[PDB]
Amino acid sequence: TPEKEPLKPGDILVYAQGGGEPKPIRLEELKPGDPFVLAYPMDPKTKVVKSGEAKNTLLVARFDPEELAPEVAQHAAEGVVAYSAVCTHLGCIVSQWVADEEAALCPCHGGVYDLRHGAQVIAGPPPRPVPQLPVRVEDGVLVAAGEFLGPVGVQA
């Protein structure tokens, strides 16, 4: 089905949506230092939101551009970084924010991923970082700029 199609580069990132038309994530809507948003890729032609495949679940956050690791910075757009939100431990959605670390927290077993340093695991049992998705801005809007730089989710 179109809703279960994988993320492709050029997909528009949209805020996680309940019913109705989706909202593209604009750069100007993300304030540096604010908690991440959960996001999905939307086919730029068909405008189908690929929210039916859980491997397309994203977290998106704006950091101070001079706080990002050089390796993280090269895939960021104006301090904006995106990562897979599928926990690498047992596949829970990494849905919570740790304010003092500016890290992503998994509620299931306390996995914490250090986002400014490539989502390095700094707590709990994830065996590996969630992978980063390359982002770019086009006409004010966040767009997927590449494939995930890594396998998504629980890897057998």
Which residues make up the interface to a copy of itself (CB under 8 A)?
15-21, 23, 29, 35, 37-38, 51-52, 54-55, 57, 85-87, 90-93, 95-97, 99, 105, 107-108, 152-154
CA distance 55 to 122: 22
Listed residue (103, 144, 98) closest to 120, CA to CA:
103
Q: Which is nearer to ligand FES, 73 or 93 (CB)?
A: 93
Q: Phi, psi (5° rounding) for residue 4?
A: -110, 10
| Residue 66 binds Pr ion, judged by CB under 5 A | yes
Is 92 a known ligand-binding residue? yes
72 SS3 class: helix
Q: Which is nearer to a copy of itself, 51 or 132 (CB)?
A: 51
The distance of closest approach from Cβ of residue 74 to a copy of itself in the complex, given in angstroms and rounded to an integer, is 25
Listed residue (126, 153, 146, 149) closest to 13, CA to CA:
146
The distance of closest approach from Cβ of residue 79 to Pr ion in the complex, given in angstroms and rounded to an integer, is 8
Residue 90 one-letter amino acid: L
- Output the six-digit token pair for 84: 């897979």
CA angle 96, 110, 18 (to 5 degrees): 30
CA distance 79 to 76: 6
Q: Identify residues 14-33 at the interface with Pr ion (CB under 5 A).
A: none
Q: Which is nearer to ligand FES, 59 or 87 (CB)?
A: 87
Is 75 a known ligand-binding residue? no
What residue numbers does the annotated binding site for [2Fe-2S] cluster cover?
87, 89-90, 92, 106, 109, 111
The contact set with Pr ion (CB under 5 A) reads 64, 66-67, 139
